[PDB]
Design a protein around this ligand. Structure first.
Ligand SMILES: Nc1ncnc2c1ncn2[C@@H]1O[C@H](COP(=O)(O)OP(=O)(O)OC[C@H]2O[C@H](O)[C@H](O)[C@@H]2O)[C@@H](O)[C@H]1O
Length: 235
């Protein structure tokens, strides 16, 4: 029981990544190689002219992706879970991740007992194509977030990336933390995420191959695609 997850986790750890594929809950996973970068995705896109706020950086544009997808399908080192402080699961992407990873994910989460807002903890990925899950707890906005809550949201992304770094992982996908059940406005969240990932990549670009913005609703897809050229200029 309380070593079930331990055994499975350690077991999957030894498998080659195409041995792992047989164990994935899905057969339609998305390999990282097939996820295009922002440098590629920006070819042919009309950037409406603006007062510039960032320098174009080819190399940083190679390390961020925006993708509309179910995040459980991404074959990356880690997907980030928009969790609750109890790590019990829930009806948003937390529920998709728990169902796709399996009941053994729940058992590891029980040993981690809680997660504070703006903080993060890592578990194994189990049946998920992703090797690990980084669980973080966003602020609960109730429509109109406070400045301290804008800081908590930024802090979920930084604590998540800090854990990536400590565990020497190089690919991660993020869902739109706090914007579902926790009610953060989608526009204000994306401004914070994009500013945060740019500055983080300025300082740590050598340590990762890809940060992925995994959006789920068209609304966030539209929001992010329109703000990406401001934070990651291409011309
Ligand atoms: N399968 C999916 N793949 C990727 N993104 C998804 C998926 N399903 C939903 N999203 C997007 O994920 C984004 C985040 O929405 P939410 O998941 O509510 O998270 P929160 O931080 O606001 O609420 C956390 C609470 O609810 C939780 O269940 C926890 O247990 C907590 O109790 C939205 O844009 C979704 O469209």
């Amino acid at each position: 029981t309380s070593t079930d997850w331990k055994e499975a986790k350690s077991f999957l750890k030894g498998l080659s990544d195409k041995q792992r594929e047989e164990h994935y809950f899905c057969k339609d996973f998305v390999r990282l190689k097939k996820i295009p970068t922002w440098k590629e995705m920006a070819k042919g896109v009309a950037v409406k002219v603006e007062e510039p706020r960032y320098k174009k950086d080819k190399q940083l544009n190679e390390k961020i992706s925006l993708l509309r997808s179910d995040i459980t399908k991404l074959e990356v080192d880690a997907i980030v879970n928009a969790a609750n402080s109890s790590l019990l699961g829930g009806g948003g992407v937390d529920g998709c991740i728990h169902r796709a990873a399996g009941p053994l994910l729940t058992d590891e989460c029980r040993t981690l007992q809680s997660c504070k807002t703006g903080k993060a903890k890592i578990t194994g990925g189990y049946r998920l194509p992703a090797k690990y899950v980084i669980h973080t707890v966003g602020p609960i906005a109730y429509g109109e977030p406070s400045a301290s809550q804008a800081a908590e949201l930024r802090s979920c992304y930084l604590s998540s990336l800090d854990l990536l770094l400590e565990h020497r992982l190089r690919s991660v996908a993020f869902p739109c933390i706090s914007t579902g059940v926790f009610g953060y406005p989608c526009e204000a969240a994306a401004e914070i995420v994009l500013a945060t990932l740019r500055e983080w990549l300025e300082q740590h670009k050598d340590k990762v191959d890809r940060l992925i913005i995994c959006v789920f609703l068209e609304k966030d897809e539209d929001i992010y695609r329109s703000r990406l050229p401001h934070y990651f200029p291409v011309a």
